[PDB]
Amino acid sequence: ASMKQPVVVIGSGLAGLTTSNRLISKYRIPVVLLDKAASIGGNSIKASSGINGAHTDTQQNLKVMDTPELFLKDTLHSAKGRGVPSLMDKLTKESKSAIRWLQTEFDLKLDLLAQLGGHSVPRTHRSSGKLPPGFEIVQALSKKLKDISSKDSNLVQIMLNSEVVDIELDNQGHVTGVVYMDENGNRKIMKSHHVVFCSGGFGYSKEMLKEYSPNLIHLPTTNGKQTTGDGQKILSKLGAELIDMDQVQVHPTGFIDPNDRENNWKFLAAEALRGLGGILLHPTTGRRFTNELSTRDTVTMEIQSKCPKNDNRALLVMSDKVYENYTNNINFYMSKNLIKKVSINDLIRQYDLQTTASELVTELKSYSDVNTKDTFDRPLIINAFDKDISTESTVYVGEVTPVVHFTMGGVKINEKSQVIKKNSESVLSNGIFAAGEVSGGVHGANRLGGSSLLECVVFGKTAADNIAKLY
Ligand SMILES: Cc1cc2nc3c(=O)[nH]c(=O)nc-3n(C[C@H](O)[C@H](O)[C@H](O)COP(=O)(O)OP(=O)(O)OC[C@H]3O[C@@H](n4cnc5c(N)ncnc54)[C@H](O)[C@@H]3O)c2cc1C
């Protein structure tokens, strides 16, 4: 394109980074990326499990069969009759293209799989190596922007510590500008005709939880302090439709930090830790109590009922085989005191469990024997405990508890990533787009692990492609 006013991208998580890279690399359309935080990446940079895609080269390599239709069925089942099905179709159908875009344009390997809760087959992609998926993907995308930016400063500028507070519209009402508070707290206007909200969720905000799912106000969260629903509020005040705001995901396994047990913020215990063979033990009895690989709403429901009302936590216990497959990530968790390597005798005594060591050994042996059916009917049992485990064998243990993690609702969007006007199917403004967690409609009542990184890519790409038509 010929260079006009910049496209303002609000938020440097994966949604904003996708949009920015696509605009600049494919179309040479200039971007200003604003983020109210002091660093790049949002909650995206913390993602530990990976990115979904159905019918990928990775899946072909690992001989896993999967299809857009299977992914959509898992997605609809998870949605429980909420959401916009056509956006679910788009998410799942364009998932192959999303993975391929990351692999080809950024040389991200995305060569390993995990099967997460609610998924019929393994389709959550991460790269081998020392770097977890959120960090790897964000670093690759951001480094590409910073490269371009060092080279033609007018094609891309990243401005941190810049909090958007409103969009300026004319009487018609086309976008004319983005109002933001700069690093010194001064009001500034960025003139623009096109803005993409990639500003993330609202899970950290107690005030918004009070408004939309007030039962969750006392729960801890995995979200960063920036996750305050700014975009959703701005766009609502401007006349945008919000949907599914009362659908908040509580992930069952936030880590408890044994040196800061009541922190309202938690490190996440990656769902991959269960997908790859971790089990959950009741914190008093020392026994398994539920299916660890259900959807998040279900696992969370079971811990909240079956673990103690006061002291609502569980023990995530992982064998040596899980350790071999998720070594760098368990190493990180151990360096932070979140996972401890302990013998079975010591587990019992350290965690004050009612079970004897010998009793727990008999139970881990039954769990691991796939010739006996699972007490709680777990759909995938891989990387279990060794047939000859004893009370002296070592296991890896962490304490986990339910945490506010993702907001499925948000501003309503169409298939072009355009924000929809309240009480209408028309766009609020041909200039206003949204992608990622700030949007609503894509997941319905529960989001499948892996699909938030994917939404960011699918809809960030779509916003850029559509702005390119209009620019
Ligand atoms: C611990 C953790 C682990 C996760 N793991 C996974 C995973 O394995 N797979 C998966 O699919 N999903 C995962 N998720 C969800 C996922 O990582 C992303 O957070 C989600 O996809 C949202 O990405 P996003 O780009 O929409 O928003 P974010 O990554 O939250 O980025 C939003 C950005 O917008 C900025 N912002 C907010 N308000 C303003 C404002 N007013 N002005 C300017 N900028 C603003 C923020 O500062 C932030 O940097 C995880 C989330 C957490 C917390």
Listing DSSP states for 339-407 in one string gives: EEEEEHHHHHHHTT-SS-HHHHHHHHHHHH-TTS--TT--S---S---TT--TT-EEEEEEEEEEEEEE
The breaks in the chain (C to N more than 2.5 Å) occur after: none
CA 209 from centroid of its chain's CA atoms = 18
Contact 399, 313 (CB under 8 A): yes
Residue closest by Cα to atom 38 of ligand 1 = 199
- CA dist., res. 349 & res. 409, Å (int): 44
201 CA from centroid of ligand 1 (Å): 7
- CA dist., res. 356 & res. 259, Å (int): 27
343 CA from centroid of ligand 1 (Å): 37
Length of the chain: 471
Test site for ligand 1: of 453, 454, 458, 459, most ligand atoms within 8 A of the Cβ: 453
- CA dist., res. 188 & res. 116, Å (int): 44
- CA dist., res. 322 & res. 403, Å (int): 23
What residues flank ligand 1, with Cβ below 6 Å? 10-16, 34-37, 42-44, 46-51, 133-134, 163-164, 198-200, 222-223, 226, 230, 268, 405-406, 436-438, 450-454, 456
Test site for ligand 1: of 49, 199, 267, most ligand atoms within 8 A of the Cβ: 199
Residue of 12, 19, 7 lying closest to 460 (CA atoms) = 19
- CA dist., res. 271 & res. 274, Å (int): 5
Q: CA–CA distance from 256 to each of 249, 336, 397 (Å)?
A: 18, 11, 11
269 CA from centroid of ligand 1 (Å): 17
Contact 237, 280 (CB under 8 A): no
Neighbours of 374 (CB within 10 A): 14
Strands 439-440 and 410-412: parallel
Contact 102, 86 (CB under 8 A): no
Strands lying side by side in the sheet with 439-440: 242-243, 410-412, 439-440
Residue given tokens 């799942």 in the structure block:
92
468 is in an annotated binding site: no
Residue closest by Cα to atom 27 of ligand 1 = 200
H-run or E-run covering 181: strand 175-181
61 is in an annotated binding site: no
For the CA of 201, the nearest atom of ligand 1? 30
Residue closest by Cα to atom 18 of ligand 1 = 44
Residue given tokens 């609503």 in the structure block:
440
3-state secondary structure of 59: helix
Residue of 32, 348, 412 lying closest to 188 (CA atoms) = 32
- CA dist., res. 4 & res. 193, Å (int): 9
Hey, what amino acid is at 155?
L
In sequence order, what are the residues at sequence separation of 6 or more whose Cβ sits closer than 8 angstroms to the Cβ of residue 427?
Answer: 414, 418, 419, 420, 421
Contact 360, 434 (CB under 8 A): no
Contact 469, 446 (CB under 8 A): no
User: What resolution in Å is listed for this PDB structure?
Assistant: 1.8
Neighbours of 200 (CB within 10 A): 35
Taking each continuous run of H as one helix and of E as one strand, the counts in the chain are 15, 19
Contact 461, 17 (CB under 8 A): no
Instruction: Give the CA diameter of the chain.
Output: 75
The number of CA neighbours under 13 Å toward the Cβ of 160 is 10
H-run or E-run covering 8: strand 7-10
Percent helix, strand, coil in the chain, to 5, is 35, 20, 45
- Just list the catalytic residues: 251, 274
Contact 189, 179 (CB under 8 A): yes
Contact 319, 277 (CB under 8 A): yes
290 CA from centroid of ligand 1 (Å): 29
Q: Report CA dihedral (299, 374, 317, 341) to the nearest 10 degrees.
A: -170
Residue environment code for 69-97, b if the CB has 16+ CB neighbours within 10 A, otherwise e: ebbbebbbebbeebbbeebbbbbbbbbbe
Residue of 411, 407, 400 lying closest to 435 (CA atoms) = 411
Residue given tokens 């296991």 in the structure block:
395
Q: CA–CA distance from 470 to each of 21, 65, 316, 432, 464 (Å)?
A: 17, 39, 51, 12, 10
Residue of 337, 281, 291 lying closest to 314 (CA atoms) = 281
User: What are the tokens at 415?
Assistant: 């298939």
Contact 19, 9 (CB under 8 A): yes
Contact 43, 227 (CB under 8 A): yes
- CA dist., res. 266 & res. 161, Å (int): 24
Neighbours of 149 (CB within 10 A): 18
Residue closest by Cα to atom 13 of ligand 1 = 47
56 CA from centroid of ligand 1 (Å): 24
Contact 84, 442 (CB under 8 A): yes
H-run or E-run covering 165: strand 163-169
Contact 245, 239 (CB under 8 A): no
H-run or E-run covering 462: helix 451-470
